[PDB]
């Protein structure tokens, strides 16, 4: 009835995007309306960019929002990129991402 719970105790809320692990793999879990879905891996391969590819540091904050993985909200081209420094608004250290092609 709105609130989202993973049966683990975490009483999320309809729209409290979060991140869940599998004791080895990463996975972003979110509660929409029909239930609770997630994004396997979440992250993506990083090449060149500003960090020549490296372990991003998400979920980070950009433009005032948050991103648990790559994103193209910082450009008008469509190239996926991520952050490698908790402080991207100070360092600007970011990397790109493929995902598809």
XYZ file of N, CA and C in Angstrom:
303
model
N 0.839 -1.226 0.000
C 0.000 0.000 0.000
C 0.861 1.258 0.000
N 1.832 1.306 -0.906
C 2.708 2.459 -0.993
C 4.117 2.153 -0.524
N 4.296 2.066 0.790
C 5.604 1.779 1.364
C 6.212 0.530 0.737
N 7.532 0.533 0.587
C 8.237 -0.601 -0.004
C 9.147 -1.276 1.019
N 8.942 -2.572 1.223
C 9.748 -3.335 2.170
C 10.363 -4.558 1.495
N 11.624 -4.835 1.811
C 12.321 -5.975 1.228
C 12.271 -7.188 2.150
N 11.397 -7.134 3.150
C 11.252 -8.232 4.099
C 12.502 -8.376 4.963
N 13.420 -7.423 4.836
C 14.658 -7.447 5.605
C 14.619 -6.424 6.738
N 13.551 -5.634 6.782
C 13.416 -4.627 7.817
C 13.386 -3.219 7.256
N 14.025 -3.031 6.105
C 14.069 -1.724 5.462
C 12.702 -1.340 4.906
N 11.995 -0.484 5.637
C 10.672 -0.034 5.225
C 10.760 1.190 4.321
N 11.092 0.963 3.056
C 11.205 2.047 2.088
C 9.849 2.708 1.862
N 9.797 3.601 0.882
C 8.566 4.303 0.550
C 8.419 4.432 -0.961
N 7.183 4.346 -1.441
C 6.905 4.445 -2.869
C 7.708 5.567 -3.521
N 8.927 5.247 -3.944
C 9.774 6.236 -4.586
C 11.038 6.533 -3.802
N 11.589 5.512 -3.153
C 12.808 5.682 -2.369
C 13.958 4.884 -2.973
N 14.185 5.072 -4.272
C 15.253 4.371 -4.982
C 16.437 4.090 -4.063
N 16.874 2.834 -4.041
C 18.000 2.432 -3.208
C 18.889 1.436 -3.946
N 19.888 0.912 -3.247
C 20.806 -0.053 -3.840
C 20.946 -1.284 -2.956
N 20.811 -2.457 -3.563
C 20.921 -3.711 -2.830
C 22.081 -4.552 -3.353
N 22.657 -5.364 -2.473
C 23.775 -6.223 -2.844
C 23.387 -7.694 -2.753
N 24.229 -8.557 -3.311
C 23.975 -9.993 -3.291
C 25.147 -10.743 -2.667
N 25.866 -10.069 -1.776
C 27.002 -10.688 -1.119
C 28.147 -10.967 -2.073
N 28.151 -10.280 -3.211
C 29.201 -10.461 -4.207
C 28.966 -9.567 -5.421
N 27.700 -9.371 -5.773
C 27.348 -8.539 -6.919
C 26.559 -7.308 -6.483
N 26.541 -6.295 -7.343
C 25.823 -5.057 -7.060
C 24.470 -5.047 -7.766
N 23.508 -4.331 -7.193
C 22.173 -4.252 -7.776
C 21.370 -3.103 -7.171
N 20.859 -2.228 -8.032
C 20.060 -1.091 -7.585
C 18.587 -1.477 -7.511
N 18.017 -1.410 -6.313
C 16.617 -1.767 -6.119
C 15.752 -0.531 -5.900
N 14.576 -0.524 -6.521
C 13.648 0.595 -6.396
C 12.210 0.108 -6.283
N 11.372 0.907 -5.631
C 9.968 0.563 -5.462
C 9.083 1.549 -6.215
N 8.568 1.110 -7.357
C 7.713 1.950 -8.188
C 6.287 1.995 -7.645
N 5.409 1.160 -8.199
C 4.029 1.136 -7.750
C 3.451 -0.264 -7.717
N 3.774 -1.058 -8.731
C 3.284 -2.428 -8.812
C 3.998 -3.310 -7.794
N 5.193 -2.887 -7.400
C 5.966 -3.640 -6.430
C 7.337 -3.040 -6.192
N 8.375 -3.844 -6.398
C 9.748 -3.387 -6.211
C 10.682 -4.065 -7.209
N 11.293 -3.263 -8.072
C 12.214 -3.778 -9.077
C 13.639 -3.328 -8.780
N 14.582 -3.760 -9.610
C 15.981 -3.397 -9.427
C 16.745 -3.488 -10.744
N 17.984 -3.004 -10.738
C 18.822 -3.031 -11.931
C 20.107 -3.812 -11.674
N 20.172 -5.026 -12.212
C 21.341 -5.878 -12.037
C 22.621 -5.151 -12.435
N 23.630 -5.235 -11.574
C 24.913 -4.592 -11.833
C 24.833 -3.086 -11.614
N 23.873 -2.446 -12.273
C 23.696 -1.004 -12.149
C 24.821 -0.254 -12.856
N 26.045 -0.459 -12.384
C 27.210 0.196 -12.966
C 27.480 -0.314 -14.378
N 28.540 0.201 -14.995
C 28.910 -0.203 -16.346
C 30.389 0.057 -16.613
N 30.922 -0.593 -17.642
C 32.326 -0.432 -18.005
C 32.648 1.029 -18.299
N 33.812 1.478 -17.839
C 34.236 2.856 -18.053
C 35.502 2.917 -18.899
N 35.457 3.719 -19.959
C 36.596 3.869 -20.857
C 36.947 5.340 -21.052
N 38.231 5.612 -21.263
C 38.679 6.978 -21.465
C 37.934 7.970 -20.595
N 37.520 9.081 -21.195
C 36.798 10.099 -20.455
C 37.728 11.060 -19.741
N 37.626 11.104 -18.417
C 38.465 11.987 -17.616
C 39.310 11.185 -16.629
N 38.982 9.905 -16.482
C 39.709 9.029 -15.571
C 40.239 7.799 -16.301
N 40.174 7.828 -17.629
C 40.648 6.715 -18.442
C 40.061 5.396 -17.953
N 38.841 5.454 -17.430
C 38.187 4.257 -16.934
C 38.670 3.861 -15.553
N 37.748 3.812 -14.597
C 38.084 3.447 -13.227
C 36.818 3.195 -12.409
N 36.963 2.607 -11.211
C 35.827 2.313 -10.332
C 35.091 3.576 -9.895
N 33.986 3.874 -10.571
C 33.192 5.055 -10.254
C 32.915 5.133 -8.755
N 32.344 6.252 -8.320
C 32.032 6.450 -6.909
C 30.567 6.834 -6.714
N 29.667 5.916 -7.049
C 28.237 6.166 -6.905
C 27.643 5.319 -5.786
N 26.399 5.625 -5.389
C 25.625 6.716 -5.987
C 26.169 8.091 -5.611
N 26.413 8.922 -6.620
C 26.928 10.267 -6.395
C 25.825 11.299 -6.589
N 26.187 12.572 -6.489
C 25.223 13.651 -6.658
C 25.663 14.615 -7.754
N 24.803 14.804 -8.748
C 25.101 15.703 -9.856
C 23.865 16.502 -10.252
N 24.029 17.815 -10.364
C 22.925 18.692 -10.732
C 21.915 18.803 -9.594
N 22.234 18.185 -8.459
C 21.343 18.230 -7.314
C 20.668 16.899 -7.044
N 20.749 15.991 -8.010
C 20.140 14.673 -7.872
C 21.197 13.618 -7.560
N 20.822 12.348 -7.681
C 21.746 11.252 -7.405
C 21.735 10.216 -8.523
N 22.851 9.509 -8.678
C 22.975 8.485 -9.709
C 23.803 7.308 -9.204
N 23.185 6.132 -9.153
C 23.867 4.931 -8.686
C 24.709 4.308 -9.798
N 24.774 4.982 -10.942
C 25.547 4.484 -12.076
C 25.737 5.569 -13.132
N 26.317 5.188 -14.267
C 26.558 6.122 -15.357
C 25.310 6.948 -15.654
N 25.455 7.934 -16.532
C 24.341 8.799 -16.900
C 24.774 9.852 -17.914
N 23.809 10.380 -18.658
C 24.090 11.398 -19.662
C 23.338 12.690 -19.358
N 23.286 13.049 -18.080
C 22.596 14.261 -17.651
C 23.560 15.440 -17.555
N 24.790 15.234 -18.013
C 25.783 16.290 -17.964
C 26.213 16.752 -19.343
N 25.646 16.140 -20.379
C 25.981 16.499 -21.752
C 24.742 16.479 -22.642
N 24.903 16.942 -23.878
C 23.800 16.979 -24.830
C 24.080 16.072 -26.024
N 25.018 15.148 -25.850
C 25.381 14.218 -26.914
C 24.714 12.864 -26.704
N 24.900 12.303 -25.517
C 24.312 11.013 -25.204
C 25.344 9.997 -24.755
N 26.518 10.480 -24.361
C 27.591 9.604 -23.905
C 27.489 9.361 -22.404
N 27.290 8.103 -22.027
C 27.175 7.736 -20.622
C 28.486 7.989 -19.888
N 28.391 8.578 -18.701
C 29.575 8.871 -17.903
C 29.291 8.696 -16.415
N 30.345 8.443 -15.645
C 30.214 8.255 -14.204
C 31.248 9.087 -13.451
N 31.177 9.051 -12.124
C 32.110 9.800 -11.290
C 33.058 8.857 -10.555
N 34.275 9.327 -10.302
C 35.275 8.526 -9.608
C 35.672 9.164 -8.281
N 35.177 10.374 -8.039
C 35.477 11.093 -6.806
C 34.195 11.550 -6.118
N 34.006 11.119 -4.875
C 32.819 11.488 -4.111
C 32.453 12.946 -4.358
N 33.463 13.760 -4.649
C 33.255 15.178 -4.909
C 33.519 15.510 -6.374
N 32.547 15.218 -7.232
C 32.681 15.493 -8.657
C 32.479 16.977 -8.936
N 31.751 17.643 -8.046
C 31.484 19.067 -8.190
C 32.700 19.894 -7.776
N 33.733 19.214 -7.286
C 34.955 19.883 -6.855
C 36.151 19.388 -7.665
N 36.159 18.094 -7.963
C 37.244 17.492 -8.729
C 36.885 17.410 -10.209
N 35.654 16.997 -10.491
C 35.186 16.874 -11.867
C 35.686 15.581 -12.502
N 36.332 14.740 -11.700
C 36.858 13.471 -12.188
C 35.721 12.524 -12.551
N 35.530 12.309 -13.849
C 34.469 11.434 -14.329
C 34.972 10.504 -15.428
N 34.182 9.479 -15.725
C 34.529 8.516 -16.762
C 33.325 8.243 -17.657
N 33.575 7.665 -18.827
C 32.505 7.358 -19.771
C 31.995 5.934 -19.573
N 31.028 5.537 -20.394
C 30.456 4.198 -20.310
C 29.883 3.769 -21.656
N 29.954 2.472 -21.940
C 29.438 1.937 -23.196
C 28.013 1.427 -23.029
N 27.874 0.289 -22.362
C 26.564 -0.308 -22.133
C 26.095 -1.070 -23.368
N 25.980 -0.361 -24.485
C 25.544 -0.972 -25.735
C 26.616 -0.835 -26.810
N 26.763 0.374 -27.334
C 27.751 0.643 -28.372
C 28.163 2.111 -28.372
